[PDB]
Ligand binder design. Structure first.
Ligand SMILES: [Cl-]
Ligand SMILES: [Cl-]
Lengths: 164, 164
């Protein structure tokens, strides 16, 4: 069944798609990061930088793929071109064909989300990096609510959404 | 005196500019990397990933700046948006105002250079990353020889080149 892989600079999109695709399951890669941080002596920093995170999370994803009734929805937040490539070639290796998207979001929307929980230049650098073609397919969310992003993503992948 | 900071995906440009700007000096950041690799217990990997490389190379650059007769020319090869930012804010901190450029080079030119000493997708990912606006000012070298890139860079920074 389809795998919808959504990279973002921030979440709600994944949830919205989930609510409107019956049988769908939200696979959260961070669960593998939390396991690895607890199982590793002397670990610090971003769990998603653990050397085993990419291969073990993708192994789990492959198994999840075989068990999924409906579409498998995977929210990620990756900025590193090298980690992105590693992930993309890992999927391919495992024979997994995913619909992969990167959300291009307006600076003010990102800054406002971060504040409701931040150097503007550092945020803008990130958003500028995501706009690189190594991150295609791009979905620009300017002027769109979560419902409309979800709808746009579903249209691109050829999926019919249940109503809101 | 002006600092001409040239990031590239590959070298010859720096040399050409050097040959046509009397009094100029080519500052090679990799010399600091080689020192740090030899001075560090258990070190492996890219010397330019050494945690002290950014701050110590930039300290050296600041001193070089005070001693330079002519323009200071600095060839770098950086792909990491995070390392790029670190470098850019480090310069600013040290009060150094540099003319910073990233060469956008054609895929075939890069692939051909690498062969004369390589996964096409991995190269293309890198070139796509460099085209991000976090890497401005961009200089697209399509159709240009080293002499013409040098000339273009000099024009942008307001410098008169000696003849070839
Ligand atoms: Cl795209
Ligand atoms: Cl530019």
């Amino acid at each position: 069944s389809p795998i919808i892989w959504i990279n973002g600079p921030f979440t709600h999109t994944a949830h919205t798609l989930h609510e409107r695709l019956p049988g769908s399951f939200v696979f959260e890669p961070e669960e593998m990061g939390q396991a690895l941080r607890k199982l590793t002596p002397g670990f610090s920093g971003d769990p998603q930088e653990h050397p085993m995170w990419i291969p073990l999370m993708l192994d789990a994803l492959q198994y999840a793929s075989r068990e999924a009734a409906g579409p498998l929805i995977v929210p990620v937040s990756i900025s590193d071109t090298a980690r992105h490539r590693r992930l993309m070639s890992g999927l391919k290796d495992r024979g997994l064909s995913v619909h992969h998207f990167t959300l291009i979001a307006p600076l003010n929307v990102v800054l406002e989300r971060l504040r409701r929980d931040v150097n503007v230049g550092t945020v803008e650098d990130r958003l500028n990096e995501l706009r690189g073609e190594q991150f295609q397919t791009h979905i620009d969310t300017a002027g769109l609510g979560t419902q409309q992003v979800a709808e746009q993503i579903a249209a691109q992948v050829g999926l019919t959404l249940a109503p809101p």
